[PDB]
Structures are given as C-alpha cells and as structure tokens.
Amino acid sequence: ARQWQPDIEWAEQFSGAVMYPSKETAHWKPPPWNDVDIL
Amino acid sequence: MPSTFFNLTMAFSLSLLGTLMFRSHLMSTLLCLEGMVLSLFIMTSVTSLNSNSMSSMPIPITILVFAACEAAVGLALLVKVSNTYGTDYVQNLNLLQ
Amino acid sequence: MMNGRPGHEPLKFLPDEARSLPPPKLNDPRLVYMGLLGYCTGLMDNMLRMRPVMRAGLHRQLLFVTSFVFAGYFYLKRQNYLYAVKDHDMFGYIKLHPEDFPEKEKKTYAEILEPFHPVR
Amino acid sequence: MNPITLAIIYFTIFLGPVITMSSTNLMLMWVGLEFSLLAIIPMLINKKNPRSTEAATKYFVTQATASMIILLAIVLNYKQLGTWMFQQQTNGLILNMTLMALSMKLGLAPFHFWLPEVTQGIPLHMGLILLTWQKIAPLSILIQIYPLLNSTIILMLAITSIFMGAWGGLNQTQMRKIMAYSSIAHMGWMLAILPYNPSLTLLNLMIYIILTAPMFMALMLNNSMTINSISLLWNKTPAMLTMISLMLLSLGGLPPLTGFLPKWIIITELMKNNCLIMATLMAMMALLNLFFYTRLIYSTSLTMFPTNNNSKMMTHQTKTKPNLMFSTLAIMSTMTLPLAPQLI
Amino acid sequence: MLKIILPSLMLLPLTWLSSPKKTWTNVTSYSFLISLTSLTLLWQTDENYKNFSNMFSSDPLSTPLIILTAWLLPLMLMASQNHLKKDNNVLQKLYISMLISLQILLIMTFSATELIMFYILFEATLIPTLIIITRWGNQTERLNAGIYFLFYTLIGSIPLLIALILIQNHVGTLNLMILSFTTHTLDASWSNNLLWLACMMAFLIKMPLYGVHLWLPKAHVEAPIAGSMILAAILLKLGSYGMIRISIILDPLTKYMAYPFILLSLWGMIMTSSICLRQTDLKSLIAYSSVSHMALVIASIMIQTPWSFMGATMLMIAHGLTSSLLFCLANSNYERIHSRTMIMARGLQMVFPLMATWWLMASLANLALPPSINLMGELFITMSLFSWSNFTIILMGINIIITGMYSMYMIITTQRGKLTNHMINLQPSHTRELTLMALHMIPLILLTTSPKLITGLTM
Amino acid sequence: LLREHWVHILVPAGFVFGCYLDRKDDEKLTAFRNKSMLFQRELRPNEEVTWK
Amino acid sequence: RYGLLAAILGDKTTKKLHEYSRVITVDGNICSGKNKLAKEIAQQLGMKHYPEAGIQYSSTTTGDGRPLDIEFSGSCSLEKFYDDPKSNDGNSYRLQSWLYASRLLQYADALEHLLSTGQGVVLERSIYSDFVFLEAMYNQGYIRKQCVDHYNEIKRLTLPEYLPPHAVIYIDVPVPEVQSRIQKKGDPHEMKVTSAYLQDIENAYKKTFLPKMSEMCEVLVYDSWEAEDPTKVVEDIEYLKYNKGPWLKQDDWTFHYLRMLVQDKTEVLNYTTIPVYLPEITIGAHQGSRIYNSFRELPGRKYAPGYNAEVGDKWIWLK
Amino acid sequence: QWQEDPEPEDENVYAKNPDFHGYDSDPVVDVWNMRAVFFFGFSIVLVFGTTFVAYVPDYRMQEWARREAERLVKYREVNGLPIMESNYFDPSKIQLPE
Amino acid sequence: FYVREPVNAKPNWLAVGLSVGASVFMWIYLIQTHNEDVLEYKRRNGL
Numbered sequence A: 001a002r003q004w005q006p007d008i009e010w011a012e013q014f015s016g017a018v019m020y021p022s023k024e025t026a027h028w029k030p031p032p033w034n035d036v037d038i039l
Numbered sequence B: 001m002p003s004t005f006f007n008l009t010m011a012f013s014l015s016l017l018g019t020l021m022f023r024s025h026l027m028s029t030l031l032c033l034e035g036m037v038l039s040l041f042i043m044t045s046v047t048s049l050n051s052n053s054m055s056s057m058p059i060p061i062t063i064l065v066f067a068a069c070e071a072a073v074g075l076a077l078l079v080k081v082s083n084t085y086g087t088d089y090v091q092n093l094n095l096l097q
Numbered sequence C: 001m002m003n004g005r006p007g008h009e010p011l012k013f014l015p016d017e018a019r020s021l022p023p024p025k026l027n028d029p030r031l032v033y034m035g036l037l038g039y040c041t042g043l044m045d046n047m048l049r050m051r052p053v054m055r056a057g058l059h060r061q062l063l064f065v066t067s068f069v070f071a072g073y074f075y076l077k078r079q080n081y082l083y084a085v086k087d088h089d090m091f092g093y094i095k096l097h098p099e100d101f102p103e104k105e106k107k108t109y110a111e112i113l114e115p116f117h118p119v120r
Numbered sequence D: 001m002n003p004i005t006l007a008i009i010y011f012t013i014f015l016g017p018v019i020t021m022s023s024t025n026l027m028l029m030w031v032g033l034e035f036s037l038l039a040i041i042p043m044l045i046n047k048k049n050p051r052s053t054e055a056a057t058k059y060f061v062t063q064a065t066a067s068m069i070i071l072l073a074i075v076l077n078y079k080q081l082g083t084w085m086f087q088q089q090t091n092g093l094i095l096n097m098t099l100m101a102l103s104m105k106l107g108l109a110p111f112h113f114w115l116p117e118v119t120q121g122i123p124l125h126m127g128l129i130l131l132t133w134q135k136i137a138p139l140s141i142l143i144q145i146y147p148l149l150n151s152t153i154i155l156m157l158a159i160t161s162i163f164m165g166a167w168g169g170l171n172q173t174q175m176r177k178i179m180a181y182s183s184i185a186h187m188g189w190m191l192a193i194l195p196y197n198p199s200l201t202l203l204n205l206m207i208y209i210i211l212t213a214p215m216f217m218a219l220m221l222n223n224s225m226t227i228n229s230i231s232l233l234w235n236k237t238p239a240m241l242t243m244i245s246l247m248l249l250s251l252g253g254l255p256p257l258t259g260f261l262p263k264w265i266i267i268t269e270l271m272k273n274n275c276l277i278m279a280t281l282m283a284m285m286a287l288l289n290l291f292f293y294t295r296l297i298y299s300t301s302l303t304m305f306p307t308n309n310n311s312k313m314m315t316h317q318t319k320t321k322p323n324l325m326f327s328t329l330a331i332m333s334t335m336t337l338p339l340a341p342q343l344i
Numbered sequence E: 001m002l003k004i005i006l007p008s009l010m011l012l013p014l015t016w017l018s019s020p021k022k023t024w025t026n027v028t029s030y031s032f033l034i035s036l037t038s039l040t041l042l043w044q045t046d047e048n049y050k051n052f053s054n055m056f057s058s059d060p061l062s063t064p065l066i067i068l069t070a071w072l073l074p075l076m077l078m079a080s081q082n083h084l085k086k087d088n089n090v091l092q093k094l095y096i097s098m099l100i101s102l103q104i105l106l107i108m109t110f111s112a113t114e115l116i117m118f119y120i121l122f123e124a125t126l127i128p129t130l131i132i133i134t135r136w137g138n139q140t141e142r143l144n145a146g147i148y149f150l151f152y153t154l155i156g157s158i159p160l161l162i163a164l165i166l167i168q169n170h171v172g173t174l175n176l177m178i179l180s181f182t183t184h185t186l187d188a189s190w191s192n193n194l195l196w197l198a199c200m201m202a203f204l205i206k207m208p209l210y211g212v213h214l215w216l217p218k219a220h221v222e223a224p225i226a227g228s229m230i231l232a233a234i235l236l237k238l239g240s241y242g243m244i245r246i247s248i249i250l251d252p253l254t255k256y257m258a259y260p261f262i263l264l265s266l267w268g269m270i271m272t273s274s275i276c277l278r279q280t281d282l283k284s285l286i287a288y289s290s291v292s293h294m295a296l297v298i299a300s301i302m303i304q305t306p307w308s309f310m311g312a313t314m315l316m317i318a319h320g321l322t323s324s325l326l327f328c329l330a331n332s333n334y335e336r337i338h339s340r341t342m343i344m345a346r347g348l349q350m351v352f353p354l355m356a357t358w359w360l361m362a363s364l365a366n367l368a369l370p371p372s373i374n375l376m377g378e379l380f381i382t383m384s385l386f387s388w389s390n391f392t393i394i395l396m397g398i399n400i401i402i403t404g405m406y407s408m409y410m411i412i413t414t415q416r417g418k419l420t421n422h423m424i425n426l427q428p429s430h431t432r433e434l435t436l437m438a439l440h441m442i443p444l445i446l447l448t449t450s451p452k453l454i455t456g457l458t459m
Numbered sequence F: 001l002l003r004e005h006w007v008h009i010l011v012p013a014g015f016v017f018g019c020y021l022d023r024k025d026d027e028k029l030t031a032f033r034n035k036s037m038l039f040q041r042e043l044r045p046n047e048e049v050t051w052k
Numbered sequence G: 001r002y003g004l005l006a007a008i009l010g011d012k013t014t015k016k017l018h019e020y021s022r023v024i025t026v027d028g029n030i031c032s033g034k035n036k037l038a039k040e041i042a043q044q045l046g047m048k049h050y051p052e053a054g055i056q057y058s059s060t061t062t063g064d065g066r067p068l069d070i071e072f073s074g075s076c077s078l079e080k081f082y083d084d085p086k087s088n089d090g091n092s093y094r095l096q097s098w099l100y101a102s103r104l105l106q107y108a109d110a111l112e113h114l115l116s117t118g119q120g121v122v123l124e125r126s127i128y129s130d131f132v133f134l135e136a137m138y139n140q141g142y143i144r145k146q147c148v149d150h151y152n153e154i155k156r157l158t159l160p161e162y163l164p165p166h167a168v169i170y171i172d173v174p175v176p177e178v179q180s181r182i183q184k185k186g187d188p189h190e191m192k193v194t195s196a197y198l199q200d201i202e203n204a205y206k207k208t209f210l211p212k213m214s215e216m217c218e219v220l221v222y223d224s225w226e227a228e229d230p231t232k233v234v235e236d237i238e239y240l241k242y243n244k245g246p247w248l249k250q251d252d253w254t255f256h257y258l259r260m261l262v263q264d265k266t267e268v269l270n271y272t273t274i275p276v277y278l279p280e281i282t283i284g285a286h287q288g289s290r291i292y293n294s295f296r297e298l299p300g301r302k303y304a305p306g307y308n309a310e311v312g313d314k315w316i317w318l319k
Numbered sequence H: 001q002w003q004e005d006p007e008p009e010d011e012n013v014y015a016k017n018p019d020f021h022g023y024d025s026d027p028v029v030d031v032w033n034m035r036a037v038f039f040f041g042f043s044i045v046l047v048f049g050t051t052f053v054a055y056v057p058d059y060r061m062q063e064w065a066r067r068e069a070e071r072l073v074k075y076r077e078v079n080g081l082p083i084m085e086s087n088y089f090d091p092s093k094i095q096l097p098e
Numbered sequence I: 001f002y003v004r005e006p007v008n009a010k011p012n013w014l015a016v017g018l019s020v021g022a023s024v025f026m027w028i029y030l031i032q033t034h035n036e037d038v039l040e041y042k043r044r045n046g047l
C-alpha cells in the first residue's frame, strides 16, 4: 500500500501569488524567490 | 484663536486630504506632509503663547526637530526611489501587490 | 483593574505583603508541571538540533528543568498574591458597601412553586 | 552595517518603544513613536532590493501621517485642557483620532493594507520586529488611555480586522503575508477587549509574540517564504515539522493548546460585559483563520510534498541550528494551557 | 480516576522509550491491564454516584464508556499492527501514542465534572483523530475528509463555547453536579430557543444527525482502521454523552424545541438505512449503518423518557462494539482484497471459514436478533418513541425492515456466493485478525448476560 | 534488576502514583468527614476516623 | 564560531590578505590539461588547490568523507551522461544540477578558506564556468528549454552573492585536440562524446564565458603550448594587476557578512533547492523519504557531528 | 516523469515463518506478541474481569430494594397502611400558594 | 571520524560549568527561599 503522497500536480496549485486565483489576479505571477526583481 | 485656531486646524485637514490622495510625484506628498508639521507647530506655539504656558515652549521646537529628521528619512527614501526607477512617481511602487 | 489600588508598588514584582501568604509548596503540581514543561523544552531542543534526544546535554536538561522550576516558584508566588489581593479587595467592598450586596433569604422549596412541565 | 551604526539604530528601535511606555507626558510618548519610525526604516532596506525601497516608502508614509495625526490629537488636547495628556473631560473626537491614528501604526482593520505589503518585502527577521516589537509601542499608548476610548469604534475595528485578516489569509500563499494577515487578526482580538479589560490585551499580545516569534524563526531556519518552500521541511529538517504543526494550530484557537486561552478569556470577558453579539461573530470567523493554518499544516506535515534532488545536498551539510529561543518559546507556547489560571 | 488516567499517560513514555521490536507488546499488554483497573469503577453498590475528586467524576452514564474507551486502545493497537508495520519505527511510535492520547483524552472527557472541561477535552480529541485520518489515510481524499471532520465539529463547537460561558454567568458554575441540583429553567423566549440550539448543535453534529452527517461517511472511508474504530465506537458517542449531561439545564425548551431534530432523525433513520441498501463500498455501508443507528439515539435523548435514555445507553455501548467489529473485519477483507468494493471478494466463507462466523455474529448484532443488548436497546427506544406518538412505529418500522436487508446483504454478497476466481490469492487469516474480532464479540456476549451495567442514568 | 525491566515498571508505577495522588484527594476533601446527616455516628470506641 | 563578535574583536579578512591571495580558476574543455596547470599554480603560490567538483565531492566534504552511494549523492552518472544522451530519466540534467551544487559548495568552501586563512585558492572550473556545459547540452538534444531556465534561475539566485573570480586562467585546445587527448586516457564513456557537443562547450567558453568574465576579472588565455609550462603561466599571473573588478569594494565590514554566508553551507545552497518542480529534479516523496531515512541512518550521520557514537564520538552526555 | 519508487509488493509473510501469528515478521517477536496478548487479553481480563464484575455486590442498590420493599410491604400491609400512598412529600409539609 | 572535525568533538567545558553550576545555584537559592519563606509566613501569621 502507498498512502497517496501528493504528486506534482497537487503541489502545483500552491504556487502562484494567490491560492484562489481571481479573474485578473491570476494574471499575476509568483514573487521572485531571491526577493529581487528584473526590471 | 477661537476662529484663528479653526483656520490652522482646517489647514491641517486640507493638508490631511492632501497626503492621503496621491497623484504622480511622491515629493508632493512629502511636501504636503510638511505642511501639517507647520500647521501643528503654529497651533502649538499659538496656544502655548496665549496660555502664557512658557514651560511648554520646549515642545513647539521638539516637534520641529523630530519632524525635520522624519522628513530627512522621507527624502532619502525618495532619492532611493528615483535611483531605482528614475522617477518619484508612485505608480512605480506597485511591486508588492 | 487592580492597578491604581492604594499602596500599589509602582514597579515591584511581589510586594512584601505577599509574605503573609503561604509559600508555594515546591512540589505543587504546577511547579512540577513547569518542570516537565521544561524537560520537554530541553528534549525538544536536542531533537531540533539533531542530537541523541535523551542522552545528550544532560547538563542542559538540568538547566532547563531547573530554570523553568525556579521561575515557577517565584512566579506562582506572585500570581498567588495577585489573586489574594483580589479577595482582600473584593471581600472588603462587599462590606464597606453592604446595602448593595444584601444577604438574601431563599424560601424553602416547600414555599417556592417552580412550575412542572410534564414529559409524557 | 558598520557595527556602530547597527548599535545606534538598534538602540533607537529599542529606545523607541521604551520611551513610549515609560513616559506619561504624551509628547514624550509621541517622540517614542517617532524614534521607532526612524529606526525601523534603515533596517527595512538592508538588501536594498527594488521590492525593499517600495516597502520602506510605504511603511514610512503610512507611519508618518499617522504620527502627525497622533500629534494633532495631543496639540488639540493642549487647548482643551492645559494638560499634555488625555483626561476624563477630553473631547470624544480628540480620542477617536488617536484610535484611528494608532490603529494605522498598528495596522488594524480598514488600515490593514500597508502591513501585508511591507511584511512581503522585508526579510524574515526584520519581519518579526516589524510585526511584534513595533506593536508594543502603540498598544501601550492605547492601553494607557483605555478608560477613555470608544467601545463602538474599537469593536468595529476589531471585528473588521478579524474578518480582513482571515479573508486575506485564505488566498495568500506567501508565508510572510500569511503572517502579516494573522497579525492583523490577532491584533483585532487584542483591541476588542481594550475598552473592557486592558490586562487581557497584554495577554493576547504576549501569547501572540510567544507564538509568532517561534513561527518566524521556523520560517527562516529554512528561509522559506513559500508554503511549497516550507512543505519540503520534512527533507531539510524533520524535527521542526512536529512543533510547526502545533504552533500554527495554536495560533488559531483550537482547545488543548495555549492559543485557546487568549480567545477563551477574551470571550469570557466580553460575555461578562454582555457583548454576546460581537463576541459570537468574532469567534466564528476566527474559525476561518484555522482553515488556512491547517491548509499549511497539510502541505508541511500531514502530507509530504515532492522535493528536489539538490536537497539531498543540503541534508549532507550540517544544518546551522535554530537558536534555543525556538524551543523555550515553542513549548511555553504550544502547551502552557494547563497553567492558564496564573497567566491571566 | 487517575489510575485509569495516569497509568495511561505513562503508556506514552513506554511507546517511546521501549525497543522498536518490543514496542507493540509492551503497549498492548499494558493497556489490557489498564482496562482491568478501569473495571473497578463498575463497583457502585449504591445510588450515590462516585465523585472521585473536584474535577473527576464517574456516574452510571460515563462508567460504561470509560471502560469501552480503555478497552478499544488495546484493540486499536492490535488492528493497526499490520498496516503501520511498514513504517520507519518513529512513525509507528507516533501512531501508537496518538491512539494512546485519544483514550487518555476520551477517558477524561467521559469522566469530567465541569462541562467546559468536556469542551476543551471534547474538541481536543479532533487533533489526535485528524492526524490519524490525514497522516496515515490511504486515499487521495483524506485531506478533504480531514477538512470536513474539523470544520463541521469546529463550527458547531464555538456556539457551545459561547453557550457554556453564558450559563456560567447566568448560574455561576459549569459543575455538572451543581447545575443539576440548582434551578436552571429556561424561559421559552426566542433567545433561549437559540441557547438550546447552541448547546445541542455541537453535540448533534458529531452524533451525525440526518442534516449534518456527510462528515462521517467521508471520514471513515479514507480513515485507517484504528481511526474508523475510534470514530464509530468512542468519537460519535462523545456527542451523545454531551447531550445527556447538557439537557439537565435547558429543561423546559426541549419539550417543544426537539420536534425539528426528532423528525429529522426518524426520517433520516429511514433514508440513511436505505442508501446502505445500494452502496458499493463496504466501509461506506457500515458508516451509514452507523448514522441510522445513531439517529435512533438522538431520538431518544430528545424524547427524554427514562426508557429512552437507557435504551440509548444500551445501544450506544452495544452499537459501538458491533460497529468496530464490522469496521475491523471490513479492513481484513480490504487488506487482502486491496479494494473497498463490496461486489469483489464473493464467497469468502469458502476460503476463510471462521472470519465468516465472526461476520455472521456481527451482522446479527447489527440487525436486532433478540438475546443481544443491541435489540434490548432498540426495543426500548422503540417503546418510548411509540409513547411520544403511536405513529412513530411506522418510521421506526421501515428502518427495522431495511436494517435487516442491508445487514444480511453484507453477509450475502461478501461472505457467500461463488468464490472470486483469482483475485490475488487470499492468504489465510492471522490469529491477530481473529482475536481482534473475538475481543470485540466476547465482551458483547458477556454484557448481554447482565445488561444492568450499561443501562444508563435513568435506570 | 534495572535492565529493560525498568521500562516494564513505568506503567505499574503510574498506577501506584495514581492511587497515591488519589488517596491524597480524599485527605483534602475530608470536611463533612463524618458530619453528613445520613451517616453521622458517634465515633465507636478506638476509632478516630469514620472513613479514611 | 565566526560572527560579529569575532569580527568586532579583530578577525578581519582585511588583515589576512596578501598579494598571492586571490580566487583563480582555470577553465578548459573536457580535457584541457587544466588539472595539471592547476596543481602547479597551486604549488607556486602555496594556493590551496581545490579539485574539480565531483558527484561525491559533497560527501568527501561532509562527515567521514568516504564516497556516498549514488542514490545518496543524487543518483547522477557522468558515465550514463555519455552512453545515454537525451535519456528518458534525464540523468544528464540531474548530473548538471548536482554539479552546480557541488561547485557552489566548493566555491563557498574556497571563499571560507580565503577569508579565514588568507591563503588564495585555485578552483579549476567554477560556478562561473559551468553554464558552458548546459549551453552545449541545450544546443544538443541533451536538455530541453525549461530545463535550461531552471538552471539559469538557480544561477541568478545564488551566483551573484559570491564575489567574482579574481582572474580566470584559461586553456584552449581545438576540438580535434581534445578528442585525441581523450583517446590517450581511454574510458568507454568519456570516449563517446559527440564532437559537436565539445564544439558547443568551448564555444560557450569563447563566445560567452571568456568575454563576460574579462571585464569583471582578469581573463588570461593560454594556448596549449603556453600550457604544460606552469612556470610561464604562473609567471603571468604574478604579472597581472588585480585592479578591475567588484573585489575592490570589499571592506572588512563587508567581508564579514560574506564570510558568515560561506560559513553556512546550508545557506550557500539554500536556493539550490528552490521548490520549482521540473520533473528530472524532483526526488518524489516516497523515494525521497526512503533515501533520507537511509542517508540519515549512515553511521555518524544519524546525529550532528560530534554526537553520533557509532564512529567513536564521546562525551555526548555533557555536550 | 519525476523520480519515484516502483510499487512495493506485499510479502507473503506466510511463505517464511509458516507459523506467522500476524503480529511481526521475525518469529520469536510474533510468538511473544501473542503469548502475551491472548493472555493479558483473554486470560486475565475476560476471566478475572468478568469474575470481579459478576461479584460487584447489589450494584446500584437493586439487591437492597427487593428487601426494603419486602419489609415495607410486610410492615405496610400488616399495619393496614396503603402500600404506596398516593402523595409522597406529605401534604402538611407543602405550603401551597394560598 | 569526520573530515571536518566536528566542532563538538570535545565538550565546551565552560558551557558545562555555567550550566551545571548555574542550576545548583538556582536550587540552593530556591530551597533556601522556601524554608525562609515558610518561616516568615508562619510567624507573620500567628503560626
């Protein structure tokens, strides 16, 4: 038996700058891991 | 002062309405922010002066000394911003969304 | 609340008046709990730092079980006082303002007639 | 930082709240607030990343205007009573200003927008100070003036904060902002009981500090600002998975852990004072806070998220340890409940 | 009652300190004896109940349970030695400790004088249970099931917290002894009509009522066998124990504020019983059987007639033992079959002769065969319900016919018919599996000999 | 004999402690020792406690 | 430990630096003889010569130092890299990602030796010269585009913090040369390396790496002939002037923080484990948990250094 | 696809240890984990427990009440008093709202 | 043993003596406080 450990897809949702993505909110992208931006 | 302390107070509210509604340049806020400190300094000095409360005159100035540095910090942030974005415009400050 | 009380010690931990109260028995369940609370802190530390959980820092384990407990006796000693002040204060008022807290007579059930709702 | 500067700043960030608390002349309370504002801004931009300058410039403007409003209240009082300090007689509007202003510096309710954003752009460390050693100062000023403030407003800011904090948190996935949102919420409970029993505000704060300080030093042990990042905790450092689980459920009000006491006694005090309307709604959405806490629980502990091969490399190397404070503040926090009577 | 509790706590040190190979026997052997110390509480010999000390008490209603709570920890630890025997030696010692804390907490909750002590311990039991269900749950959906189990109980719980703090202010102490010997008569206002709902709703939720029972089917489905045993045998009955001790106050309102629930439960009893009739997952069917047979209980703790109450006390202890027995044997089929589907695995008696006898006795306990406490229980609730309104027999009469049908269908399509051609060959029965069962039924046979002990407070 | 039987003595010891703590509960709740109405009797000869 | 306390009281990298103290890397193709030049340059100025980063370089770095089992070291084979290019399991990308982590550890260990001892360090290939392998791999069917992005993201997140190589000694030997050089030391795997791939490595060296580091650091190139003559190359290094570059601003109070970073290996590679789930990199929870329970149970690893009795540690009851 | 383990089969513990009792894989632990479970389970809980529970005396007073009735019924009938008078709390004690 | 000699190879003997010695000062002050305390309590009140 393999109690189902979460796969990649279950993990994917928790990425993104907002859990429950809105209409325009989803357009956003996760913050840079280094806390420094490219602009 | 009965109505001379209402002009200064409304000056502070007109300066309040200013700092709270931004528009482009950040400097205009900071500058506005200072308009309040002047109004507070004037009102504190005015009442202290007509209450003959000399023990309190220290405050009118302590208010300015702390307000000046406060502004110093504010401007260094401003210079830091138009070094990172080439402008003081607030819209630029929208990365933390 | 209890601050502003007459005689309040402006920054003191436990005013000497608290001497009058009994000292907390060192084995008071609470102080013993603090002890266990402490031992666990110690054990937990060892764990988070990846050391043999129980067989390590046997000096630290002692510092912990003995720091927490030390703290307890002197804290409980106070919290005990605070509660004791509360009664001094509360009971006193009940008297100084007696009319407001009047003794009441409770009619023997014989007299009182609570209604009976039948279950049926 | 030239270690000298580090000292001057840190001293100010620490003299800042302490002057506020110790003094009675409100003016001296205002400059205590002013020094905290000046000291925190340098540390906030330590990385000097583009996000950081944004953080500080917001924090500063929000802090500065509130500071000016607090001063106006003191200036107005000076003319309604010669005293430099709020008294029974104080005009009601004078006090309400101080509530709004101080509720902006503390960031409660409809002024809760700056905190989540500054908590997002500052380091985890300076995040803690910005959340917990900067709330002590303003709260002190409020707790001192509690007898005089309005029960209605506080309650509205209290309830609003609870809701905003909860709702905001549900969507957030960045940890720094999840904590910012929690702080808004807990800050709400604290200000709810201020008019009735200030002494409980000081409990609902300490417990928040004894809960949040371990929680953040946990987030940074692995410096994870993402839940996905904290979820691989099981590989990076397995032991903290157990206590991270209890501390987060403790932050929410679940009964065996220490976190229930602040909510329980605040509810007991509000019902003693008859707010069984307000208290009920607060407790209910308080339950929303646990949902997002447990969703994190799921990712970090109850379920094991997939990790990266390069992680095996980080395991090899000895993990720099978590300070002792973590333990002493994790246990005193996760389980002191059996000792509640003496805490209150 | 600190021997039923302190020695229990010490189990935790033993699960941790003991050798990885010997951890299982030290824990199971010792809690069997922990149950033996629990039996001392049964020595009543007088009407006056036993107030051990200020915080800890045991009256006829709690005593029959404290013993069951202590009894199942041994069994739970024996039913989960298989799954959980594939773990890393520190996941086991966590599971064993989790099971240990449940009865420590549950023993105290059932043996608590202060109603809010009940609340704190009451809602704490969710922590150990949620970990058992979510951490070791086999299916992808346990994260979901855990959420359902935490929120339905939690949203009900905060209203009770407000209500109990409310009565403390109204009366001045939440001590069940005093609250009983003091005059707390609600006044049928609109507000009180809410208080009553606040106190009963949290208890009505974990005692699945027809309206809020979706949490229990989802929870037991993916929960490991030990969690499913705990939820059915002790966890759900926490709600019943609460309704018995809390309705001492709120005495006048339940006369007329109960109709809504009573009708919800009796119609619920029929529909929950019926959907058992066509449900493909065996663990699913036992769970709805549990909802229906618990819907009878909320309809006896609300009619409030002496017979109802002890009908309830009889059925709760009895159904607790029977349900576990059913959940335990369901697991034995699940581990060899590897699927929860009822249609697969047909004909087992042909290959597992005895487990089938245990299956038959468990089903006869499930339906009301007469020389069983299970029947005495239903016979009594049935009587009072009839007294409440003679028409009740119709609805409590469609349930009996349906209960017979699904109970035997579990035996007919799982333990009879032609053998499944060649599922993974089904290894013979372990002696642990069979004992875990024997340990459930031998007490069911012994209790049926002298029903007086589990009759409740009323009689 | 403490070699893996000091483990086996953990729980047995908990019982002892339990009973002790329990019998130190009676000692506390000993008002109305014999002052209850249904059970008030004159201490029979050579008995200083009706119930201990 | 090294911390502000130590730094406050002396312990300044400023007082421990000397002309011979620099970060010098020598980079070349798969076989540039850089191994030899390195040792010599090292012998010349006493520079601690760090060996090229390996799969088990981290294991040699940590604890016992005995080589770890492949699965414990991330299951990477350079050997399988070559015999099975564009593999279904992606051992080649996993090999490259582990290699970047290994040099990150090596570069950080090198910087720690440089700022503490004061001695310089020759590190052969570096994090700065790792991208050429990936560029060539993407130019070939070896790695797909996202795989490239994931490496670039890790590189952008971690490499900027560390100071640049002072100078970057370089060898060049045309692809024909290296292939031939391969034949001399025969190894079935190393042998089967498609030339075009070697073409892409050097190219990425010349086109992108060589100039890029030429501004920030002293790039001196040496044809093969200049090479094999460590004396001459060593001479030239001692000749170049260490002026241009970001190293100029490293005041003592700035070095302290850099030191405290390299002093903490768990941070050096903190961003190497970022939760970006590309399929090759993912451990997977069930496999990862097993590899962990097994790596953590190795003697001396089940507890922190100094506390595991298996290898003979003592005094644990008072530590 | 990510790296992860291939499904682990479940062993036929009955292939080795043909005397498997279901508790643990190695044989001696199994034997000593049933020799202590049947014993502490059945031999001294179902037996000693039922012995003690059977001998609890006059549980909840229902052995006392079948005699007290008998002497009350003996006393009430012989002295001519009603066997169960119809008011329990005497009417004289009650002070009905006048 | 260890390539990088564990920093914890041999105990920080200061950390023992301020950890052990500190705790023994705690007790001797704590136990002292109690008996001393009991006394004052006893005499402060009648006995």
Ligand SMILES: CCCCCCCCCCCCCCCCCC(=O)OC[C@H](COP(=O)(O)OCCN)OC(=O)CCCCCCCCCCCCCCCCC
Pocket (backbone or CB within 6 Å): C047, D238, D239, D241, D242, D245, D246, D256, D301, D302, E012, E090, E091, E094, E097, E098, E101, E104, E105, E124, E127, E128, E131, E135, G302
């Ligand atoms: C009031 C009661 C509340 C509920 C009490 C029972 C639940 C306590 C809370 C549990 C919350 C976490 C649940 C999920 C945890 C998952 C942990 C896990 O997956 O295992 C890995 C973890 C770390 O492994 P590591 O210790 O590093 O391995 C050593 C190898 N030599 O392995 C470990 O962390 C091992 C150590 C864990 C800590 C010990 C926990 C023991 C159980 C605590 C019971 C406390 C009972 C209190 C009863 C109170 C009654 C009033």
Ligand SMILES: Nc1ncnc2c1ncn2[C@@H]1O[C@H](COP(=O)(O)OP(=O)(O)O)[C@@H](O)[C@H]1O
Pocket (backbone or CB within 6 Å): G029, G030, G031, G032, G033, G034, G035, G052, G078, G081, G095, G096, G099, G100, G130, G133, G134, G190
């Ligand atoms: N980042 C990398 N990706 C793939 N292969 C690499 C990487 N770094 C080094 N290698 C391989 O390591 C092998 C040995 O390199 P090197 O030590 O220069 O050879 P030699 O020891 O013969 O001089 C080379 O064939 C090269 O392909």
